[PDB]
């Protein structure tokens, strides 16, 4: 799960509530991480006003952004052609981190038990 | 460690106070420095009075 | 030198005048992709001419002749130069490389000066505090807003001493003697002074008793 | 019986710092206590306090920890207020040679002799071994514990106020600052030594040293 | 890699792009983590305007911190004695954490493999 | 240690420098993580002006949560009936993560050594 | 072995760093040298905003 | 029995370094412990304690490793609390000339005489040879172990504390030896030597070296 | 039993070079070992090692090569652990005059006398000639071999750390560089000599020289 | 590369920088001259018969 650093993109192409992809600005496309097959980063879509939704980036091609909806459970909404793609959702990432550290500790304990 | 003040001079405010000349000093107020001492200025005397208020010349 | 002027770049020097001083703004790219941007103001008045450096790049200058304050354009905005009513900016001053004839270490620092007491710097600081409070209030009401609420400013003295090209100490005590570190012996010493307030003078000695002498 | 406040006033008068802003009052109190210790060492007659001390059962005993050296043990204090028997010094080595098991000898209600060696200051032996914590008057060169505050009193005599002032000046002007002077410190140390030297009353220091009974 | 909390400071010293060390305001010096031998923390140098550079502090003493420049890929740029050093850059430590979780899981799996 | 997501509320009932419980706005109470026995999230109180104090939420019931002060060492402070409770602190949680990772590789290495 | 810094002067880069005058120094940045000390420069004030991009005059 | 905290405060008040930046607490503590060892060497009367030391089987014995020199071996401690017999010094050469195999003599429950030579510090012989680890109180020149922390306590007398202050002044002021070619450091050394010279209480350092028993 | 690390830390603190850049750690180690040797020579009581050494058959014997001078030969070690007989010094010239073929007689299982001449340090004669390599305890002024690494331990007493520091300062400050000072070196040599002079515990150096038995 | 001419003969070529270097010995001359060869800039060269004299200046 790759991560991004200080990348805010204007969502130039209007995105339907059931949308397979979105388009970032040409300048900000390279600002986001490179990604690859099987590697992804989550992004928070901030609409005008307080509306915020969280998505999953399967991959990027140049300035075109492949997207999937409703990862944390945020409801799908229609998107105007002026929006923000920035920030990293702490809930999913730190939850995965806490689960992974505990899983590693449990696996090490099981390995110790099997060795004994 | 004597400090002696003689031949007084006027004020130069474009200088840090410690870096003033040896005989230059701050706030040279109502002093006439001619002979090299602290000769006091005389008090103004009222000669005449003006007619119209707020005279600028 | 010719080298320094050529590297500065005379082709794109933006010029300006303030109090009989030529304000030159330079923005040139050093090889290997390093960029230096700053303002080089020239004052020939005095015993010998010298350069006072500044770090405010300006796209264009305008010296309003009627009121002698420079107006320089940076970021599509008109900024005055050291105009009244603003808090003092951080000052950089790195001393000449002092090659002592005998390698020694210094054990006395006297940073003289006075805290802000002219009350116009105090008024400017109060205005800055009001601006900080206003921006804090307006960011505090965001529907919320993480971080922000920027810290207010402060008046400080920060003198850094370079032993032989290495920073050994940063001293902030003022009007009282301070101490460097020990265990290092160097002969090419230099002093850098960083502060938001003015400093009268700095004197160094290996011992406080020697500091008594001068 | 003078308080420390007077000596602090003197020290604030000699050094041209009456406000105690540079030489802090804690620092001057420290110099006062160091000076008290130093004069007590140089001239033991400066501070000798007769203290009654219980003795642990057995030949071996320990001087009170706040005592540099015991000079005399005049009286063996009988129970409650009665002064009791007197005690006279003897030789430890002959107490060893004859009756080699003198430590194992039955304890006595009142000790009769004490042996003290200058080389070991914290240990003095009693004869016979003490019993049930019998107390004895001890005349020892007591050390002034500390001078915490200005109003703290100094149990030494008012004679040595000049010596305390000179010692405080010596240890204060020896500071590594512009406000302290070095030749002044050396002269003050010499003045302190001379002031203790001309003490014709107490224990002599110049002519005879450590020979006082 | 030690982490900082709520530490925003002004760079009182003009930091050259090839600069070994930097000095924050006296009050904010202790606000930075004390660090130790072999220990570093991420520091983002946000100058005036939008330009920013990221580095780690190798060691700090009193008010001055030693620095290692251009470590996370940001180009070396000049710094005004009025700057901001604060925050923590997402990419580096989080890549390290996602790699450490995988390393711990793989090492544990090899542990049961050797046990069997 | 659960984590929070996009949660920000006002502390309506004035908080003493020594406080046992907090009261958020009625609407936003559900947005904070629900938690359970022995399970907590760290919540930051950014009061008026720059002052901020960190606290630990041992548990939340309906709209009011029992609170514990002075976790990272921030001074206990009095808070006015208007406040902000939001954000996730880097130092504590991510320090827990770095400790857990190192514990994981250490336990895996110990398991391998016991297997050998 | 005392070194004293007083009556500060500006930067003269056509000189070896060692061979500079006794009171001349490198990188005189954001300093106004008038009284003989390190008087700090004030901060710029945003007086007005220009309309059209890429203004050269 | 003063802690190191006081001495560090003194030395940090003489040198105008109170927060300890030129002279850190660790190096000042190092100078304190070095001065304690040096002052014990100069005047053994400063720091004497009696230590219960068991003796390995055989005539040949080794005193505890961190002891400069044993002055007296007064009492041979019997099993558990009983003080037991006392011991007197004797000369090894006479023990050697006659009964040359006095080391092979049957070990004794309690030693009677001990032989010590100032030349060989660490080795002292016991007559008769010791048996099964009999413990004996030893009056030995113990060396202060170290001063690792500010709060650590120095078990030395409370005027040698000022002597340590002066010695630390020496060891710190020799660092900036450029000033006056170390004249100030030599002055502090002279002051320290005079301070121990005029110690009228303990072993006289002014008189003949090792003259005092 | 102090390691060389502490003394190198001192020498790095005295000379204003803590990083050991100009004065390398090997160089300071070499000065430490030179100081140990010099202190052993000046005051033999500093390092005297009781070494059991086999004796070549015959009257002539050689002192262990890592020994300055043998001071006593207390015990003639019997086979395995038994201490055996003691040995007392005699006169070689009278051993020559009477029984001139005293080298040629039957060897003895245990030597009975030894003759040592100061003018010849490496040779000491035994009477009767030793047989089958009988070992004897030798008390000699051992020379500390070397200080290869910083963590290497110095077997001398911890009290001579001040003398070692003064010697290292004297030798390092005698370097012909800007960073070394000469008058400082002379003062440090004087300080080392004085520090060894006031060693009231060990072998005297100022008053009596080479007269210690 | 600094080459030293004793009395018209090259005695040594020294390449160490920022650290004390040593000439040869056993030659005595009174007309000394210094030759400097380098691809980089050099601040100064100072000569003394002893390191302790180099301490003086």
Distance between the termini of chain B: 53 Å
**Strand arrangement across the biggest beta sheet of chain B:** 1-2
Biggest β-sheet of chain A, characterized? 6 strands, antiparallel
What is the oligomer described by this structure?
A: part of a larger assembly
Instruction: Please estimate the helix content of chain A.
Output: 10-25%
- What strand order characterises the main sheet of chain A? 1-6-3-4-5-2
Count of DSSP H/I helices of chain A: 1
User: SSE string of chain B, helix = H, strand = E?
Assistant: EE
Apparent shape of chain A:
elongated
Q: How far apart lie the N and C ends of chain A?
A: 35 Å
The number of distinct β-strands of chain B equals 2
DSSP summary, beta strand count of chain A:
6
C-alpha geometry of chain B: elongated
Largest interface: C-G, 70 and 47 residues
- Strand percent estimate of chain B: 5-15%
The Cα radius of gyration of chain A reads 17 Å
Largest sheet of chain B, described in full?
2 strands, antiparallel
Give the structural class of chain B.
little secondary structure
Order of helices and strands of chain A: EEEEEEH
Number of helices of chain B: 0
What proportion strand of chain A?
25-35%
Q: Please, could you describe this protein's structure?
A:
Chains B, G: This is Virion-associated phage protein. Chains B, G: It comes from Ralstonia phage GP4. Chains A, E, F: This is Putative tail fiber protein. Chains A, E, F: Keywords: Viral tail protein, Virion. Chain A has one helix spanning 90-115, and strands at residues 9-10, 21-23, 41-46, 52-61, 64-68, 84-86. Chain A is an alpha+beta fold and 116 residues long. Chain B is largely without helices or strands. Chain B starts with 30 loop residues before the first strand and ends in a 17-residue tail after the last strand. Chain D is of the alpha+beta class and 213 residues long. In chain D, α1 (4-14) packs across α4 (161-173), α2 (25-42) packs across α4 and α4 (161-173) runs antiparallel to α5 (182-197). Chain D has helices at 4-14, 25-42, 92-97, 161-173, 182-197, and strands spanning 49-54, 58-62, 67-72, 88-89, 113-116, 123-130, 135-142. Chain D has 5 helices and 7 strands. The two termini of chain D are 26 Å apart. Chains C and E meet through β3, β12 and β14 of C and loops of E. β15 of chain C pairs antiparallel with β1 (3-5) of chain G, so a sheet runs across the interface.
